[PDB]
Structure 1
Amino acid sequence: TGSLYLWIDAHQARVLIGFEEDILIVSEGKMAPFTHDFRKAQQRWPAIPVNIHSMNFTWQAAGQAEYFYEFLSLRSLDKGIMADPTVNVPLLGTVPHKASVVQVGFPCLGKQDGVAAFEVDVIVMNSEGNTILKTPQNAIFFKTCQQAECPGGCRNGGFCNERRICECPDGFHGPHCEGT
């Protein structure tokens, strides 16, 4: 009956876990079997690696019925390791009829090495306002962060970010914050 789909594309799944196959999360508005026993499923998930700064999810409401998504919580539980996870979409919106990519960003601050715990609480509502899908209650996700080490180091009180670029202050630019 249902028309809702949520999945990780074959390409994104390959960079993440090594297998170039679509990972189905929701098919025809029903959670995939692996997500039924969430705690068993989660214990097979390693922390997101340092080389992964963001993850692409694909979703669609493939029918004539309208669906509404809402990001209730985008929260880092280790703010000194990683800032709040981000989404490249409005927090409340319609699930698109055309399959579209939602990028979840994992902003490691670059000040500390470590594993940051975080939440991505999202609900899907039908046109009656009822919640029909949602992140499993109390779900925790993990991201591995590394301390930034820029080539040569950032001068003029500049800090190195996790993309190996110098974060330069007042009238200071260049690869190591030298120019004016």
Structure 2
Amino acid sequence: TGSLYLWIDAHQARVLIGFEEDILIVSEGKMAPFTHDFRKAQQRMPAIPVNIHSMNFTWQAAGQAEYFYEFLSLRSLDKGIMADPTVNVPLLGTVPHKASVVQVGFPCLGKQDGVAAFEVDVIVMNSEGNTILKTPQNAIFFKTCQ
């Protein structure tokens, strides 16, 4: 079975949706069932509130197999409202064996007000160079800036 995990820790989840419980995105190298019908899932995703400037994701490659991630696109679609989203990790790297936090930042410029559309396109490859996991095609996320 797969060894990859991606989740939002209970504390971060509490700050985001009010419920203090881990939000599983990938478990044992498999996308969580709520993400399969992605367009339906995006409707239950509100625009990231003004109080949140960054979000903590936790990931791990829990076994002996090596996995490589790559951020293909970190792009704001409303550059006048928010600058490009950021990550505190190199764009290309290894998924760590020890569970580690990736901080995704949403840099509202303050020179305007509104909701900024943005992309976080990431892929995970195995040691054969095959893409085994990735941000659903054409996924768009939103950040409320004031």
TM-score scaled by structure 1? 0.80
Q: Which residue of 2 aligns with 1:17?
A: 17
Aligned to 1:12, the other structure's residue is in SS state: helix
The higher relative CO (CA closer than 8 Å, separation ≥ 6) is in 2
SS of 2:75's partner is: strand
Residue aligning to 1:128: 128
Deviations 1:67-109 (A, max 9, x none): 0000000000000000000000000000000000000000000
Q: Which has the larger radius of gyration?
A: 1
1:123 is displaced (CA, Å) by 0.0
State the 1:22 CA deviation: 0.1
Aligned length: 146
Secondary structure of the structure 2 residue equivalent to 1:73: strand
Q: Distance in 2 between matches of 1:83 and 1:46?
A: 19
For the residue of structure 2 that corresponds to 1:39, the secondary structure is helix
1:105-150 CA distances to partner (integer Å, 9 max, x unpaired)?
0000001110000000000000000000000000000000xxxxxx
Instruction: Provide the aligned C-alpha RMSD in A.
Output: 2.9
Q: What are the Cα deviations for residues 8-63 of structure 1, in whole angstroms up to 9, with x where unaligned?
A: 00000000000000000000000000000000000111100000000000000000
Within-5 A mapping of 1:47-62: 47-62=47-62
Q: Which runs of 5+ in 2 are unaligned?
A: none
User: Structure 1: which 4+ aligned runs deviate by more than 2 Å?
Assistant: none
Instruction: Describe the SS at the equivalent of 2:103.
Output: strand
Partners of 1:6 and 1:39 in 2: how far apart? 20
- Normalised by the length of structure 2, the TM-score is 0.98
What is the CA–CA distance in structure 2 between the aligned matches of 1:15 and 1:43, rounded to whole Å? 19
CA distance in 1, matches of 2:86, 2:46: 20
Unaligned runs of 5+ in 1: 145-176
